[PDB]
Design a protein around this ligand. Sequence first.
Ligand code: SAH
Lengths: 265, 265
Amino acid sequence: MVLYFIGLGLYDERDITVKGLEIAKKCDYVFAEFYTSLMAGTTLGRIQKLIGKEIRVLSREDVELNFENIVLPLAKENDVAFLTPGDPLVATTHAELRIRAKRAGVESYVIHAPSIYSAVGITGLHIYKFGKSATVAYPEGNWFPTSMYDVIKENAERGLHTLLFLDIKAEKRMYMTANEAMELLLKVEDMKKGGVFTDDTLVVVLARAGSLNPTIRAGYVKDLIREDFGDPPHILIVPGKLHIVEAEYLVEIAGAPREILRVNV
Amino acid sequence: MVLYFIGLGLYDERDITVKGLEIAKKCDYVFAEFYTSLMAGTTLGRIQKLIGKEIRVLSREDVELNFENIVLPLAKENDVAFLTPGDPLVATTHAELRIRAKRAGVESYVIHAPSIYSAVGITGLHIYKFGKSATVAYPEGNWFPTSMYDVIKENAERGLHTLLFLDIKAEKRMYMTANEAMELLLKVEDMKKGGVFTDDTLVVVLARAGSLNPTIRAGYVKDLIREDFGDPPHILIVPGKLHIVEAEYLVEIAGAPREILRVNV
Ligand SMILES: Nc1ncnc2c1ncn2[C@@H]1O[C@H](CSCC[C@H](N)C(=O)O)[C@@H](O)[C@H]1O
């Protein structure tokens, strides 16, 4: 009698780990949420098919307000599993749910899955060189988010790369593009003129990580802010000072201007 | 005419994604490497039975010096797979291999899998608050590494968490423990007296991630320095200032002492 946190992966249903599939296949009740990220290459049907169980989907409100009412209860008598895109505990507040589980007298286990946070390694940028991370959020009301700007500034000053999580509103089916983010940033630039994010800043975009053919592009903002990378989800990265080997991967694989090959030491 | 970089996961032969397995089976040749890391929770033999293909294990020199002489040739006329622990491209040196694949006129695809870099999310610490990452390499002869120490310093300075990869001797099959890593850090503290890592520093240890029974513990060095965290591999983490939720998780789940609720928050 337990509760399982299983990640479904980056793109399609096949991105679940074997461990995760075997275990999902033996649980009595299987819940899931699809609001923390977007798996562009699959459908609830295929997941349900692959697993072999009916998956009751939950909304942000069900999860955040009644997890212990809807899911935890069954967990005491049965073997329940909660599915989520990517890795269940990366860039979500699901970790807290484990405390609910404990306090509800329920044993919980975690089955990891490929996360966008580590998939960025496909851009050639050294993983250890990524600093703090941030999320470009949808502007709303009379307030224009600005934190993500300072973060890029802080990391850049230290020579670190910045991972920018783009926003999502599942219910409204809104998936921020790298373009919608490059614009939101250029605006924060003018508001602060910090030299952080301009038209000559180098940027890398990763779209549909997990698919066989993700869109990996690196270039100056001016030349990319008006490009079609493809369907979502999109991720934006503002690199710091590149290593020669990083620059070479970006040029040879990501299609960046040959000029970055010449790094400023 | 195609090369696949498939990730093997975190601990056992089941940490591979259904994607990576289905593909690995459809390959004419399968290579692997276990020098960047080690699947402590399985064996090459158990892995070979899951894939149902034999696997030629490549040494470090093999890959870094003659990848284009051992792997790429067969990739021209067949579909070849290259297995590596964790998620590919998280080992900085693997990325450049894709360039070589192109140079030799070969298609290369990447099949991600759970990485320790993202799995750390299970510690209850927020992913975005992780800063630059470092590695605690085994000292040798007159050599006494110290960069890691500074990496911690710069991160916690900015309220960021520090993920410390512990060293490994693949061949000799020798895992560095969290305890050992702590002793090394305390030794650098005494050498630089920066206040960065002391008997009162709070740390989190994560052992055997990916397993259903990983060890997750959090406390002050003076109590974890000699604590037994179980079989390898080990990962050490020096957290920055904690959000009340991280602290609660570290207490409710990682058995951290209540003191952290009022000291490290
Ligand atoms: N497959 C993918 N490709 C590119 N970006 C992705 C992605 N999956 C998620 N993202 C990015 O991350 C955001 C969701 S945050 C949730 C991440 C998920 N928990 C994980 O472990 O991967 C998306 O809005 C997008 O900005």
